[PDB]
Amino acid sequence: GGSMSKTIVLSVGEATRTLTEIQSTADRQIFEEKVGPLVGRLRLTASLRQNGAKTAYRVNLKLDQADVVDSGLPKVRYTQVWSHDVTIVANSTEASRKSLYDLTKSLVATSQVEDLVVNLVPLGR
Amino acid sequence: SKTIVLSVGEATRTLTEIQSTADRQIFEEKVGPLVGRLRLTASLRQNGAKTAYRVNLKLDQADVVPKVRYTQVWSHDVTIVANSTEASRKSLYDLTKSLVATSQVEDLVVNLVPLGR
């Protein structure tokens, strides 16, 4: 009984990738895509902690994408990472937090950021 | 005078390159009060072993009241393996774009609600 395991669903068009919570502790959450062998599953680690002064919060998200050798028993060849570090001020307005979010969503969505990550092309056109 | 343009609905936010060195650039929204203009800082470095690239992007958003009362920051640290496939880098990108776009990530940043439903 009780709640099912928590998920977050990523959409790429009609396609979806579901990441399921596998750990929730004082220090962090870990979500994994429960598809394929265990080695090399897509991982998202998340934490939310107040700073020492209790004037801000720090959100950390770490997306770990392992690459697995095609043949033989599963082994990680390499791992690539995209992590986020978000500083949210405790006396901030909702509109300011929503703006930071909206602008970051837009930034990440740009073809420029895509070309930076995929082709190492510097920003600016 | 190179730019990157961010769209939030029908609002357009144009960031203009104001500084650029060997592997670090600063873009600024050249509008509004001189103080606390939206800023994006980007850099690219190789790791010590020359086996990966590190991309950093830092969006700094000041809240101005002549005086910045506070600054909120959303930084990205991307580790790109030198001998990776294009498909793997594209996937890392596509998964991250989708992740940031989720209502869950909005609720985390705006409302401090942890991920997972």
UniProtKB/Swiss-Prot annotation, chain A:
Consequence the record notes for mutating R49 to P/S/V: Loss of translational repressor activity
Molecular function as annotated in GO: identical protein binding; RNA binding
UniProt keyword terms in alphabetical order: Capsid protein, Disulfide bond, RNA-binding, T=3 icosahedral capsid protein, Translation regulation, Virion
Domain of life: Viruses
GO cellular component: T=3 icosahedral viral capsid
Subcellular location, record wording: Virion
Protein name, UniProt field: Capsid protein
